[PDB]
Amino acid sequence: VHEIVLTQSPVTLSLSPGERATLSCRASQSVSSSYLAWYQHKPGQAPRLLISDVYRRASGVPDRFSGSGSGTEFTLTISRLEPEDFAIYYCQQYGSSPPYTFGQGTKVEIKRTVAAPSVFIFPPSDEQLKSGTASVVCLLNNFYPREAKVQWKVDNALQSGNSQESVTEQDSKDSTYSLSSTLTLSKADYEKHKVYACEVTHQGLSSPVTKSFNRGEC
Amino acid sequence: QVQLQQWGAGLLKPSETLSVTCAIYGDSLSDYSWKWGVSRDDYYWTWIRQSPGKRLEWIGEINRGGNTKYNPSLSSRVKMSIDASKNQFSLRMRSVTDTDTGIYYCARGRRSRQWIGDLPPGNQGLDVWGQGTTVIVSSASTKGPSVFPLAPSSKSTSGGTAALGCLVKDYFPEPVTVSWNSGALTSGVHTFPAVLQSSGLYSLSSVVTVPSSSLGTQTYICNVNHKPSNTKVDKRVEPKSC
């Protein structure tokens, strides 16, 4: 438990290309500047070392990546952001004392205008119902920012503990997100009700949006 | 140019022994000639891992001479070997449980106090990484997915545009690939990251937005591929009224 613990801030940084990015990494106790390293990580790709030793750039690291620190607080700075620089960034203590622990990571996100999601709902299929289960899907298409609230209501009653959510990466085209929420019940629990509704709260919506259906319609 | 490559994949039941290997290219481990740069004894061949909802974890390291150093959280179950006859090094993790699922990387850490001429950039860090080996520990058996049609209806239509999709449910393990119309449909497709249910099986969705008027003209098929179970399923998503 002698381990140094690193903590990064912010959890998510939302900026545009060409802007200045600054990421903070705070150590629980003072670490020598010679043992603080930064890494870049993109999903599906291996992590790449950026800053190491005494704020020295690694191989093939452009000059827009710089590093500073005081022993307890360290900072990775990107002067101007190229599109290829939006990713995850980690800090690590390496060389001081094992284990060589990391930070929780900071995500760099593209900041665009506010976009409201398109809300769609899909009822269960006969194929799934013949197996004893019913899944209702609610899709939020192309929205920004990523903060969105999806609630399931069955006969005007809020559900809890029987739904799952999933969000896509930021789109390389319009820089939006998409969310899929799946509510799953048994065939009995499903057929014991009538109205199934998906309620969506988002910054781009003045009032929440409800997409509902009657089980008797389908 | 020094590269690392990781071969294989991990599919284990709880209590079994994980074994992963890493191969080095662009440098020798049996080369005891120090005439420039850092000594090859300053290289520490490292295993790191990351679980989907967690931070990177330094598993451990072994050097050219055989000296190992292990994270105390794993040190009781972890063994690390190296051999210069193949320029490879391997990790053995006993008593694996569900908590050990994740991506396992091999890397090269560098810790040098002395050098001949120039200290190459990347000291005091992990300067070369492998691409990552996927490892899944679970009691579940390999199971191909059930593909159900998220049928388009009036409740999935907005301004001449209709959403339709495929629910790829109850499969194990990751991953699955999803294409539409045998790859001939790519615009406006969103395939969501799989979510692990409490049953130990994965589920995800793949949706696409098409013209509404085309729903009577075009036939839409989703092609789901699950390699671990050796399954391919072509499901036709037919419209519906609700």
Author numbering:
A (entry chain L): -1 to 27, 27A, 28 to 95, 95A, 96 to 214
B (entry chain H): 1 to 31, 31A, 31B, 31C, 31D, 31E, 31F, 31G, ...
Text from the published report:
In this study, we investigated a donor who developed a family of potent HIV bnAbs with different lengths of an insertion in a critical framework region following infection with two founder viruses that were closely related and underwent extensive recombination. The bnAb lineage is defined by a CDRH3 length of 22 amino acids (aa), an IGHV4–34*01/IGHJ6*02 heavy chain (HC) and an IGKV3–20*01/IGKJ2*01 light chain (LC) gene. A greatly reduced ability for donor plasma to neutralize N332A Env-mutated pseudoviruses of different clades identified the V3-glycan bnAb site as the major target for PC39 neutralization breadth. Ab crystal structures show an extended CDRH1 that can help stabilize the CDRH3.
(c) Ribbon representation of PC39-50I Fab with 11aa CDRH1 insertion. Structures of all three 11aa-insertion Fabs reveal an extended CDRH1 that provides support to and stabilizes the long 22aa CDRH3 (Kabat numbering) of the lineage. The similarity in backbone conformation (root-mean-square deviation (RMSD) = 0.3Å) and neutralization potency (0.10 vs. 0.09 respectively) of mAbs 17A and 50I suggests that the preconfigured interface in these structures is conserved across 33 months of Ab maturation. However, neutralization breadth was shown to increase during this time highlighting the importance of continued SHM. When compared to other V3-glycan bnAb Fab structures, 11aa-insertion mAb HCs (17A, 23D and 50I) most closely resemble PGT135, which also has an insertion in CDRH1, while the LCs of these mAbs are more similar to that of PCDN-38B, with an RMSD of 0.48 Å (S12(A) Fig). The glycine at position G100C found in the WIGEL motif is present in the UCA and only retained in 11aa-insertion Abs. This sequence provides a glycine hinge to the unique mature bnAb CDRH3 structure.
